[PDB]
Design a protein around this ligand. Sequence first.
Ligand SMILES: *[C@@H]1O[C@H](CO)[C@@H](O[C@@H]2O[C@H](CO)[C@@H](O[C@@H]3O[C@H](CO)[C@@H](O)[C@H](O)[C@@H]3O)[C@H](O)[C@H]2NC(C)=O)[C@H](O)[C@H]1NC(C)=O
Ligand SMILES: *[C@@H]1O[C@H](CO)[C@@H](O[C@@H]2O[C@H](CO)[C@@H](O[C@@H]3O[C@H](CO)[C@@H](O)[C@H](O)[C@@H]3O)[C@H](O)[C@H]2NC(C)=O)[C@H](O)[C@H]1NC(C)=O
Lengths: 120, 85, 164, 159
Amino acid sequence: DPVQNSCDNCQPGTFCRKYNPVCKSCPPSTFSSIGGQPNCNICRVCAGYFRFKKFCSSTHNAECECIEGFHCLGPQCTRCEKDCRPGQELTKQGCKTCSLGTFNDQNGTGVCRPWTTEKD
Amino acid sequence: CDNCQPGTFCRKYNPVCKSCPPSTFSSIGGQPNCNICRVCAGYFRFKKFCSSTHNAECECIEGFHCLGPQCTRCEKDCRPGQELT
Amino acid sequence: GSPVFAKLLAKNQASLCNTTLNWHSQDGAGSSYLSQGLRYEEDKKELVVDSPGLYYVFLELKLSPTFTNTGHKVQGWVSLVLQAKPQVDDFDNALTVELFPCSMENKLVDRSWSQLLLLKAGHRLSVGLRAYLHGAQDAYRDWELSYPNTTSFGLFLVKPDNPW
Amino acid sequence: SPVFAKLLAKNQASLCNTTLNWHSQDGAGSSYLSQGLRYEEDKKELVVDSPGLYYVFLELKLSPTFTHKVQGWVSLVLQAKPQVDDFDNLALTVELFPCSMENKLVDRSWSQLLLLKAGHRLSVGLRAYLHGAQDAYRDWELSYPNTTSFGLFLVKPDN
Ligand SMILES: *[C@@H]1O[C@H](CO)[C@@H](O[C@@H]2O[C@H](CO)[C@@H](O[C@@H]3O[C@H](CO)[C@@H](O)[C@H](O)[C@@H]3O)[C@H](O)[C@H]2NC(C)=O)[C@H](O)[C@H]1NC(C)=O
Ligand SMILES: *[C@@H]1O[C@H](CO)[C@@H](O[C@@H]2O[C@H](CO)[C@@H](O[C@@H]3O[C@H](CO)[C@@H](O)[C@H](O)[C@@H]3O)[C@H](O)[C@H]2NC(C)=O)[C@H](O)[C@H]1NC(C)=O
């Protein structure tokens, strides 16, 4: 039934120009989760400290994760932080030293409790 | 073109020896353009003002001395006593 | 017809004041270029666009430290703002550089800005220099617009509204 | 009609010694390629059809990846076939210091008015040298979504 000459009448994986509505498919390595935006967005590349979780498609961006020994920092994993050492735990703002009278004996995993910052 | 005197700029395509625009200089002459003049402000004070043939030259305000070939930075004076202070 | 292009260089500026910048536009004033269909009004510090269309406007901010003492932490920001007299619509609200106490380790702190803008006939364009520096009593004096690698401003007509 | 191009780096994060690929198709972000030009994907070259004076520009955008002092340099080199007399001053170079990691984006531009011949082939090489840690090269990447770009404009056609 939707038949109108508009960029509102177009599907994800396309780009469309208001002045002359045509709904062209996204160029390679670009995406569009909403249809009829004037351009497709360039795909994120996950390299080095970052690895892929989700690969790029015409309708969704690639999503990163961090390689072993490192974890994501930021909403869209914009930075990698080294996994916590004993005497720390993973929180919002990343690896943080355990407080007064608290300790974590595990390296790179675990949450700390009160009963050095690494033992007893 | 290059045979041009200082205070001018000349272009190979149509050789004429045009004098440097208002706030520019050229110590050579043959050049396709004139160089923009340096401005001495803040920590820097003028020694030489800009002319068509020479750039402005900076010095540092009293209590400070030049650092670098063309006085690119200012350093606070220590003492002239030679007591290593 | 002929391509419309300009690349102006910041004229007689070092100190980081809150004023509208002046520009070198005359032929032979460094690398400054001003094509036909463009004018520069020195007294009003404005670039006048003669023909309407889509213009690729760009700004390049170049800063250099003036002091040597690393002991006094200087922080802040410097900005280049595009001023349109016939006015325009903007997707992004200015070129802004953040400076940190260790930025002084760099001989040059450079940053660029570019935007495709629809300009009308007789469009007047000028650039404002903005800065806020703190951390020392001499904050304002610790950074200057770089010399000889000069701060620049320019544009080029990408698509005229009347191409034929 | 004006001759203009603004290409964005394609599928590059890592700081390699490589010839960059570029987004040129309409709809590939803000990528633009006017009628007097073409981009050969397989050869990674921008082909100029008409001769004249071109304002060529490069914009390098880098971002830190880690949150160990890492220093060095990153470079974008304009590679012209045939060569334009100036071979030396045809490179955008950014020096990186341990301080540089305090910036979300390290941006630097390069621009040059060049005389190009008909059928001029232009490509961009990425160069980098990073030291200071065992993971030196991984600590910086080409920025995303504010992408490294390359373009030109015909300022004066020849006659
Ligand atoms: C040039 O104009 C700018 C505005 O674009 C001026 O910057 C502003 O300066 C004031 C103080 O001079 C800053 O206010 C301070 O704010 C902090 C925290 O917000 C507060 O702790 C202080 O008590 C103080 O009120 C202000 O942050 C800053 N503008 C911005 C972007 O927020 C600048 O002073 C002008 N420079 C010259 C040459 O006068
Ligand atoms: C990408 O290519 C560049 C060249 O453009 C490579 O950079 C060069 O790397 C070497 C080491 O791999 C550097 O050599 C060092 O020189 C210093 C002298 O101060 C010496 O003390 C060291 O023992 C070492 O030999 C060299 O400086 C550097 N090039 C330049 C011109 O600075 C780079 O390694 C390549 N990167 C990749 C991804 O392989």
